[PDB]
């Protein structure tokens, strides 16, 4: 999943009075100040794109309400129950939270209500054999060995499309079964031909 | 610290380095890292797929001998957690084990921790993939007995097709 991940927080140390309200400041300033160390709980190998420059933006409002967004490609674990495959469905999670700070230090909230706090672009679908039916947004708690933590979770609901695996296995298998059943209409004395049907159909089904 | 049997590994770096630094008033330091590592596990496959493998992570100090650094497992046998939650698709973790010892090198002795898992393979996939075609082809091969001797073409086609199917099962197994 490719995301613009936006965070915002108050920082009383970074209030100012100046000619302009919000400083659309360079992304270099992100390293000079404290920022949340948000990490993805189920992420495997995520990429923070930095072509041509680190794809982050930081803005400081006059009151001190910092906004800070970054461009990421996160690949995360989506455990699957393949009992009903290819006619199954999945709810892939996307869960993130502070790595170092517990509940008593940093707490995560949604910018708007959870339904509209996560938005998917209309053309943003690189899914070949899946249909993204929708998303459900929630928050929860995790009690790690270091302490308590707040984990913000989204669940993307996906339904597998059946046409590919139909053409892959079901149609060839059905045609093979009909081909085997064709043997009944031959004469009983055509032993080599009927044996050829039987063995060839067995081999095809084995493959 | 380093991992002796590590092939390739990295510390997660999104949104930042998944690292934790906590200082307590008594001078205690807690240092956490989210690490993904691919570690070598030498697998004995003579009993494959009805096998039982033993894979170990090998934590060791590189530059400091036992005179400088002493490893230990914090919390004893309760140190390693979350193993019970893992459901591998092929394997199942029969048990896990923690060991602490000292390993001797030319430079000197060093502390050593070992975290081992005893994985046991599941046979359902192999039963569906390799075995069951083999038995069913074996029953297929015996149909030639019930055909008359004079009908040579039928029995020959049956035998040759059974041999071909055994060979293609074997090669589609050994390819992977």
């Amino acid at each position, epitope marked *: 999943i490719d995301v613009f991940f936006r965070q915002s927080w108050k920082d009383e140390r970074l209030k100012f009075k100046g000619p302009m309200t919000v400083l659309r400041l360079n992304n270099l300033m992100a390293s000079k100040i404290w920022t949340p160390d948000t990490f993805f709980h189920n992420g495997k190998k995520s990429v923070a794109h930095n072509m041509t420059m680190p794809n982050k933006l930081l803005r400081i409002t006059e009151d001190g309400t910092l906004l800070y967004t970054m461009r990421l490609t996160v690949r995360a674990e989506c455990p699957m129950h393949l009992e009903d495959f290819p006619m199954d469905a999945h709810a892939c999670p996307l869960k993130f939270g502070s790595y170092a700070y517990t509940r008593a230090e940093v707490v995560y909230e949604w910018t708007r209500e959870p339904a509209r706090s996560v938005v998917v672009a209309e053309d943003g679908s690189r899914l070949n054999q899946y249909d993204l039916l929708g998303q459900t947004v929630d*928050s929860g708690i995790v009690q790690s060995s270091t302490g308590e933590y707040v984990v913000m979770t989204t669940h993307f609901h996906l339904k597998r499309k059946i046409g590919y695996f139909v053409i892959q296995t079901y149609l060839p298998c059905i045609m093979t079964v009909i081909l085997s059943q064709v043997s009944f209409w031959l004469n009983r004395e055509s032993v080599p031909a009927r044996t050829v049907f039987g063995v060839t159909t067995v081999l095809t089904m084995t493959t | 610290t380093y991992f002796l049997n590590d092939k390739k590994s990295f510390v997660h770096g999104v949104t930042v380095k998944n690292r934790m630094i906590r200082l307590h008033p008594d001078g205690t330091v807690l240092y956490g890292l989210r690490i993904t590592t691919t570690a070598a596990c030498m697998m004995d496959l003579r009993r494959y797929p009805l096998d039982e493998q033993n894979c170990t992570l090998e934590i060791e100090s590189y530059g400091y001998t036992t005179d400088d650094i002493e490893f230990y497992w914090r919390g004893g046998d309760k140190a390693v957690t979350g193993v019970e*939650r893992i459901e591998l698709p092929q394997f199942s973790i029969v048990e896990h084990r923690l060991v602490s010892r000292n390993v001797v090198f030319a430079t000197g002795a060093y502390p050593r921790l070992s975290l081992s898992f005893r994985l046991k393979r599941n046979i359902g996939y192999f039963i569906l993939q390799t075995y069951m075609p083999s038995i069913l082809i074996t029953i297929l091969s015996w149909v030639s007995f019930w055909i008359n001797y004079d009908a040579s073409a039928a029995r020959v086609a049956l035998g040759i097709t059974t041999v071909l199917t055994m060979t293609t099962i074997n090669t589609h197994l050994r390819e992977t």
Partner: nanobody
Amino acid sequence: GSLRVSCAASGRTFTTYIMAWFRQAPGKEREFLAAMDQGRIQYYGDSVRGRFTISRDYAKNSVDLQLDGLRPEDTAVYYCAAGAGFWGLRTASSYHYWGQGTQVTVSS
């Protein structure tokens, strides 16, 4: 008063499934109480947030709910469910496995 209710599974390992609790009062629909995920992640309903605590023992394949600070209108039959959350994690329709239900009553 305080209470603890356990829910043990059998015939199927639910280590990879989401295990949740629901409440049914007389004359009301099913209400979601709490849920625990494979990653030891806890979700709680607003009506019972901060009071009830959900835990999962993966070794013996069970989910436990610890109820504290009971108040009289919490009397109801409590159901234990396990399943993968599709369109859900808060809706009863997303779960396929359910318990027979245990009655709970509070006397004033």
